[PDB]
Every structure is written in structure tokens, then in C-alpha cells.
Design a protein around this ligand. Structure first.
Ligand SMILES: [Mn+2]
Ligand SMILES: [Mn+2]
Ligand SMILES: [Mn+2]
Ligand SMILES: [Mn+2]
Lengths: 329, 324
């Protein structure tokens, strides 16, 4: 199943998905919920769409695995399974998120060398790939600065380092052939309604420093769908599930992007239809609140957290009674 | 692949037991064996290219660390795999290993490339060689434990081998057994017992295969002729005790209706020597210094009678790696 060769082809169809967090079990400290079933249902939906829409290229922009250090065998198996499924649809380019195990890097470069349908980008060096219908795409990758996960330098020099990398990618973008695509794994500065670091050291990038001459800027790391800017089109697809409370109002899913030479890019969201989350708040846990909790959870198809401040004595066994109540705090 | 189809002939590069990553004599004078090992591997790769082999067989213990291979060792492994894949399709039968990441890696890679196949179960796999020859692989790795009663375990192993024999009978062009174990009753074998060993009678190896590729034993050994069963051996002399064996790979040529033939590809490894002395005296001290001076390999001194504090032999002798 090799690439097609279409002459004078000015179109490129892209599936961009990110932040899978394969392996995640949520609320381990109160009621562990393995998110695998829900997550795979979403991934199957995304794979089916890429097939339906006959995409030319698939972009994976990191945090595909929940465990940055020691992913389980099941999570790794799921990842390789979906990578394989995607490769059968269109060539895949992978920009993994922050990781520590060298196993992914060794694996990545080897697999890239032996197959024309997958490319791992794990440095700042540009890569020229070929899409499903023969389109030439220059990839401009910006991963988490490795080795120096500890900066070993002040904020001024480090910012200048990041800024210098971005200027270099800009210059390399100018030497493109058909299309040029930026792939980044970081936090855009000044994100509207952004919670904060989910237990990690963050790389903060001003959106204006994203090379303006690229056709699409594919970003990952942020769990909410966000259209960052239009020139160049810069998007976080978001995660596929609602990973924790705080993500109740987010849009979750992937994106379909259509590029045409000489024309503005267009996109459509591929919504994951994730299970919903709800936080219930009460001044005090009384019979009025106690019935409010039971009532709500009864017809709610997602997971519920209860927060209350005032002491109410020994609570009744709500969690043993309500299967979708995953936390009381 | 080419599409002759060669049907009648099949040329095989069989190499094994590389032990990438090994540093020897760490508790006396560590010697990183990588330079020597890569020199041998380059020679083996060069030969596969020169001989234009159709199929390359790797039969385990390619990495010295069964649990935690270093990055350099894994990099070297993947480096050589890629080089070999450019020459001919490669079939890999991993040895006794842990981590399991090797297994996830293996099956994925096998799926995405038609130039490499990892066999990590007892299930037969049908592969296609360089010139389109249809090869059936009958793999026999270390079982995943298991290891209850020695009678039922031996019977379990025996049942696997009969199974392989049966599915061998299917075939098409050629059939090739790949095994990682210790043949029973090996002449001059040390150390036995290990005792983390899988012992198999050579007569239990499916007689209807064209070639039986074995790994785990560090010495070249033609085990039997029908079917031709060979341990290629390691590529370097890993420790003292391996002073006398042959190291290298094997080139095997199969022809339908004809008996199989083979030629060794010798690694020309660095030599090893153990020097024995009743006691360390000036006449012994003389022979040690003089021997090591013109010896291109590594030397061990073993002495019986205690001769007090020794002169700095290892400090003045670069290739003396052990005294005991
Ligand atoms: Mn994430
Ligand atoms: Mn991230
Ligand atoms: Mn060995
Ligand atoms: Mn072995």
C-alpha cells in the first residue's frame, strides 16, 4: 500500500489529534476509574473519520501516553495498535510529548527508517515527508527541549534559546516545496481561561513566535480544543476524554484540516462525544443536599464530584450507593 | 523482493549470540568489548552483502543484558538490524530476555516492514526471502514459565517440537527451524549446569526441516547433518574458557533435492590466554611479562602457591586483565 502520485496536486487533507493520555486511570485516591474503554471508543471514532475523509496525512502532537516514565504494557500495546491502524489510512507524523524513557527515542528513529508511512520527529531538525497522494510536506518540529529538562540557565538565556530555535524553523520553513507544517508541544502564552501546570514544568511560547510562513501549526499539550490564531492557523485539538474535574466545559476531539495552495486553510472539529463531568457544591451535607446528590447522579451518564465545606458528621455511604460518584472532597 | 522465483536455491546468513553491550572483567580490569564486537559484526555484514544472501537469521542473545540493555547497546543492535535489512530480509528469534518492551517493539516492527520478522512464540510464520522463496519458520524460544514438574515440562517441550514437526510438513519452498536452547550431551560444554537452561535432545529437532538454526552456545558447533543443525557461536571470546572454540557466523546454501552445504565466516576474534604457575617467582614473573608483550589478546594469571604481595603486574601490563 504505497503512496499515490498525483501531478499538480495543490490540496492536503490533514487529521490532527493529540493528548490521548493512553493508560490513564482517574481518581485513584477515591474511586479508580480506568478510562481505557471510553478512550478507545473515542480513538476508534477518530480513526473511522480519517478513513471516511480519506486524509492525506495524520499528525500526532504528543502526550499520547499518560505515564511520562513507565507506561504499562497495555498502554503501549494500545498506542502501537492505533499507530498501526492510522498508518494503514495515511502516513503518520508523530511529535511525542515530554518523556524520560529513552526507549521511545530509539524505537522512533528505527521505525522511521524502515517504513514510509510513519515519521517520528524528536528533535528540532526539519524533516521532509511525503503524504498519501504524493504531496511534499516539510515538518518543522518543536518538542520539549530534551537533555535540559533542567534548564541549567537563567530565564533570559533559555527564552533566547527557544526563540532562536523558532527563528531557525522559520528560515527552514522558507525552503519548503509544497507544504510546510509546524508541530509544537508547549503552552501558548496568555491562554484564555487556562488552569495551570498539571504537575509539570511548562514551556511557555508567545503565539507570535510561531513561524508565520507555515500552512498549519499543529500544537499539543493543552487538553482543550483551542483555535489559537488564524495566520498561521494554529490549533490544539484537545484531549479525547475529560481527564479530571476542571475539564467540564472543554471541547474534546480531533480536527480535520484542509490546505489548498493559494487559499486560506479550513478546518472542522471531530468531536469525541466524551463522557461528561460534574462538580456538585453544597454549603452543608443535609437531607436536602443528600437528595440533590442522589437525584442528579441517577440520570447522569458521566462522573460526579461532590464538594462541601461545612462539617456534616459521618456521611452515609454515598459512593457504595452511587456508582458514578467518584469523589467527595 | 525479487521475483524469479529462485524456488530451487536459498542462501542464508546465520549469526547469533552477539552479546552487544558486554564489558568483560569488570571486577579486575574492565574491558569494553564494543570495538572488537563491531569489527566482527561489520565483517559479517560485509560478507552477507558480498555473498548476496537471500535470508538472514538471528538466533538470540544479541544483547548481553537480558534485563536492562544500555542505550549504546540497543542503538548498536538497531543499527546492525537496519544494515542487515538493506541486504536481505531478516528473521529474529530473541533469546532469554525480560523487559517485554522488546516484544511490543518486535510485533509492531514485524507488521510495518516486510524486511524483518520477529518470532517470539512457538507459532510458525511464513516469510518471503530476497528472491521470492517461500520460507516457513518453525521457532522455538525459551518458554515463558511454566517451570512445574520436570516430567510434565519435558513433555511440554516435546509436544511443542512435535507440533513444529507437523506444521513443518506443510511448507512450500523451504522450512527452517530456529531454536534458543542447549542441545543435550554437548561435547566439552562448560558451564553445565548453568542452571538456567533449556535442555533438548538433538533427535527431537524436526527432521524434515532443511536447516535448524540454533543459538545460545558460544562455540561454533555442527550439531548434526540431517537436518543440518548449527550453533554459529559468538563473535568474540567472552570470557576465559572460550580460548579454544571457533567464533563467527555461518553461510548456508540450500538447494531443493540436494543436500545442504555451509561455510563458516570466521570472526578472527582476539585471543585469550590463561597462564598457570605453581608460584609467582622471578622465572614465572619473567614469562608473564614476556608472553603478554607480544600477545594481541587478553591474559589471565592463575597461581597456586601464595607468593605474598605481587609486583604491579597489571599496572605495567596493559593486556593482563585478571589474576586469581
Ligand atoms: Mn496532555
Ligand atoms: Mn505535554
Ligand atoms: Mn549466549
Ligand atoms: Mn541464550
Amino acid at each position: 500500500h504505497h503512496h499515490h502520485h498525483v501531478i499538480n496536486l495543490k490540496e492536503l487533507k490533514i487529521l490532527h489529534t493529540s493528548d490521548w493520555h493512553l493508560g490513564v486511570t482517574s481518581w485513584t485516591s477515591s474511586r479508580p476509574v480506568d478510562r481505557r474503554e471510553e478512550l478507545k471508543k473515542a480513538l476508534d471514532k477518530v480513526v473511522e473519520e480519517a478513513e471516511k475523509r480519506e486524509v492525506d496525512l495524520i499528525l500526532l502532537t504528543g502526550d499520547l501516553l499518560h505515564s511520562r516514565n513507565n507506561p504499562s504494557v497495555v498502554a503501549l500495546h494500545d498506542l502501537l495498535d492505533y499507530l498501526k491502524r492510522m498508518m494503514r489510512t495515511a502516513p503518520v507524523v508523530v511529535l511525542p510529548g515530554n518523556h524520560d524513557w529513552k526507549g521511545l527515542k530509539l524505537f522512533g528513529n528505527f521505525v522511521t527508517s524502515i517504513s514510509s508511512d510513519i515519521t517520528f520527529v524528536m528533535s528540532f531538525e526539519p524533516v521532509d515527508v511525503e503524504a498519501k497522494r504524493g504531496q511534499k510536506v516539510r515538518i518543522l518540529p518543536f518538542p520539549y527541549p530534551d537533555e535540559s529538562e533542567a534548564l541549567r540557565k537563567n530565564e533570559g538565556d533559555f527564552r533566547f534559546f527557544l526563540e532562536s530555535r523558532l527563528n531557525k524553523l522559520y528560515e527552514e520553513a522558507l525552503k519548503k516545496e509544497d507544504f510546510a507544517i509546524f508541530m509544537g508541544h508547549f503552552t501558548v502564552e496568555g491562554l484564555a481561561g487556562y488552569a495551570g501546570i498539571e504537575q509539570g514544568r511548562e514551556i511557555i511560547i508567545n503565539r507570535a513566535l510561531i513561524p508565520s510562513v507555515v500552512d498549519y501549526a499543529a500544537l499539543g499539550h493543552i487538553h482543550s480544543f483551542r483555535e489559537i490564531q488564524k495566520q498561521p492557523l494554529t490549533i490544539y485539538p484537545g484531549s479525547l476524554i475529560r481527564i479530571d474535574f476542571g475539564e467540564e466545559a472543554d471541547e474534546k476531539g480531533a480536527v480535520f484540516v484542509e490546505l489548498k495552495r493559494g487559499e486560506p486553510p479550513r478546518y472542522e472539529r471531530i468531536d469525541a462525544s466524551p463522557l461528561p463531568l460534574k462538580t456538585l457544591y453544597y454549603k452543608k451535607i443535609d437531607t436536602s443536599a443528600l437528595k440533590s446528590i442522589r437525584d442528579f447522579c441517577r440520570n447522569f451518564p458521566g462522573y460526579v464530584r461532590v464538594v462541601y465545606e461545612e462539617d456534616s458528621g459521618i456521611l452515609p455511604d454515598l459512593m457504595g450507593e452511587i456508582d458514578n460518584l467518584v469523589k467527595i472532597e
